[PDB]
A paper describes a structure:
The histone H3K36-specific methyltransferase ASH1L plays a critical role in development and is frequently dysregulated in human diseases, particularly cancer. There is no information available about the N-terminal 2,000 amino acids of ASH1L, though several domains have been identified in the C-terminal part, which contains the catalytic SET (Su(var), E(z), Trithorax) domain, followed by a bromodomain (BD), a plant homeodomain (PHD) finger and a bromo-adjacent homology (BAH) domain.
To elucidate the interplay, we determined a 2.4 Å crystal structure of ASH1LPHD-BAH. The structure of ASH1LPHD-BAH shows the formation of an integrated module with the extensive interface between ASH1LPHD and ASH1LBAH. The considerable size of this interface suggests that ASH1LPHD supports the BAH fold and may explain as to why we were unable to produce an isolated folded ASH1LBAH. The side chain amino group of K2807 is hydrogen bonded to the side chain carboxyl group of D2595, whereas the side chain hydroxyl moiety of Y2809 makes a hydrogen bond with the backbone amino group of I2586.Overlay of the crystal structures of ASH1LPHD-BAH and H3K4me3-bound ASH1LPHD showed that the ASH1LPHD fold superimposes very well and the H3K4me3 binding site of ASH1LPHD is not occluded by ASH1LBAH. The electrostatic surface potential of the ASH1LPHD-BAH structure showed a large positively charged surface of ASH1LBAH positioned next to the negatively charged H3K4me3-binding site of ASH1PHD and thus suggested that ASH1LBAH might bind DNA. EMSA assays confirmed that ASH1LPHD-BAH forms a tight complex with 601 DNA, and the DNA binding activity was further increased when ASH1LPHD-BAH was linked to ASH1LBD in ASH1LBD-PHD-BAH. Binding to unmodified 147 bp NCP was decreased, pointing to the contribution of the interaction of ASH1LPHD in ASH1LPHD-BAH with H3K4me3, whereas binding to unmodified 187 bp NCP was increased compared to its binding to unmodified 147 bp NCP, indicating that ASH1LBAH in ASH1LPHD-BAH prefers extra-nucleosomal linker DNA, and this preference was retained in ASH1LBD-PHD-BAH.
Author numbering:
A (entry chain A): 2583 to 2830
B (entry chain B): 2582 to 2823
The structure:
């Protein structure tokens, strides 16, 4: 089936890869510490061995500052985060309106209401000169955060891409979520994602957040193969019956 | 260097303009692959299959070249690529035609191959004539029994002697390649792919008479000892002359 089960948890078939001699899963040569010239190989499940779950960008980027190392995936304690992952973020706690957004540790959160957390797309991960983990990416706006006509209706799980970028400490990540296009949302669900953490986004906003532009190319496409994606028996037909203005 | 050189010529010279394959990381002569030295995206013939010509001409055509002759770095003898510097087995079976002129026959005629019943020859030049007939130029190696030596003189079992006896040969007269090394190299290791039976030692040259023996100081064709090209013996060999 050409199954990819790497430690990084990404399905990209870009670059050198290596197959296991027992379970037949493909893994990135860069993520594991192995050449493509090796004639025999076993994965970390078939051949249990220490694995560093934090994988550096092996083509080290040019924009990399000395002392800092860019990563394709990092660990937030026990939770693995990857480039292209959507996450829930702790709120901005600043009482100074001019100050930088201060987002506290996830460990301080009392009870998890995901609707009260900011949703964010990780574009970059890196360890700094002090080995502190950071992420860079853009925000997704919830429907109530947008300027719209009272007539406008949304999906209850609809979000909107916004050209608002931020550097965050990795501790500010509460958990992962899944942001799909409508078509993909209707077809199936990526393996190991909760129904309650699946959102729809087809539109981006301008800076005023009054203008709604259709997204043409999804920047981070999901693997649709059966080992990675659970196809629904029938395509969903969700309803745009949610209004931020008119809520109980 | 950690430079792996794998070109269609099969030579290991880091000399000349080189280009690296962005997939396998091997280096190839720009001059053999028909590419400029500064091509942003390069892939070799194995990573990006395409028609190649293994018969690579000498881009600086040599002065004093024979008229109507195109010179080459490497030429194909059927399926065997032969290169400048190669040591080869040569057919002894020959034919006369107009005058005395004996000419060595094709290797296709040979049924059973005996190494000792062939001549060892070093190829220096390779060319195609006007009719695209392939030829090689170079000098012979002499076996010990072919040398006029003092009765007391001892030899290695595979010892050969360089002689200034040059000949134009039709490429068809080549039976196969062998490997001629100095003692030091012979003792250190083997080039990849070579049979021991095709490995010989030469440290001395003779005169046209083959009575006088002179030690060679400068190897005309030094062999690449890089691990990708050369397997090193874990311990130096200890051959004894008798
Ligand atoms: Sr290049
Ligand atoms: Zn990987
Ligand atoms: Zn396995
Ligand atoms: Zn070449
Ligand atoms: Zn290549």
């Amino acid at each position: 089936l050409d199954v990819i089960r790497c430690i990084c948890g990404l399905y990209k078939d870009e670059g050198l890869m290596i197959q296991c001699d027992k379970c037949m899963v493909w893994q990135h040569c860069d993520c594991m510490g192995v050449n493509s010239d090796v004639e025999h190989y076993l994965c970390e499940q078939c051949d249990p061995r220490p694995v560093d779950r934090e994988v550096p960008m092996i083509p080290r980027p040019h924009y990399a500052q000395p002392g800092c190392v860019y990563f394709i995936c990092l660990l937030r304690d026990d939770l693995l985060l990857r480039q292209g992952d959507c996450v829930y973020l702790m709120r901005d706690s600043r009482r100074t309106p001019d100050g930088h957004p201060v987002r506290q540790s996830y460990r301080l959160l009392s009870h998890i209401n995901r609707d009260k957390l900011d949703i964010f797309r990780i574009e970059k991960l890196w360890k700094n000169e002090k080995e502190e983990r950071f992420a860079f990416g853009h925000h997704y706006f919830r429907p109530h955060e947008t300027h719209h006509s009272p007539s406008r209706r949304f999906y209850h799980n609809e979000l909107f891409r916004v050209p608002l970028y931020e550097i965050i400490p990795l501790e500010a990540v509460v958990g992962t979520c899944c942001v799909l296009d409508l078509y993909t949302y209707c077809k199936g669900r990526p393996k190991g994602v909760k129904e309650q953490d699946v959102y729809i986004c087809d539109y981006r906003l301008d800076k005023s957040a009054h203008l709604f532009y259709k997204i043409h190319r999804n920047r981070y496409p999901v693997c649709t193969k059966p080992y990675a994606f659970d196809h629904f028996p029938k395509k969903l037909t969700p309803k745009k019956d949610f209004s931020p203005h008119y809520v109980p």
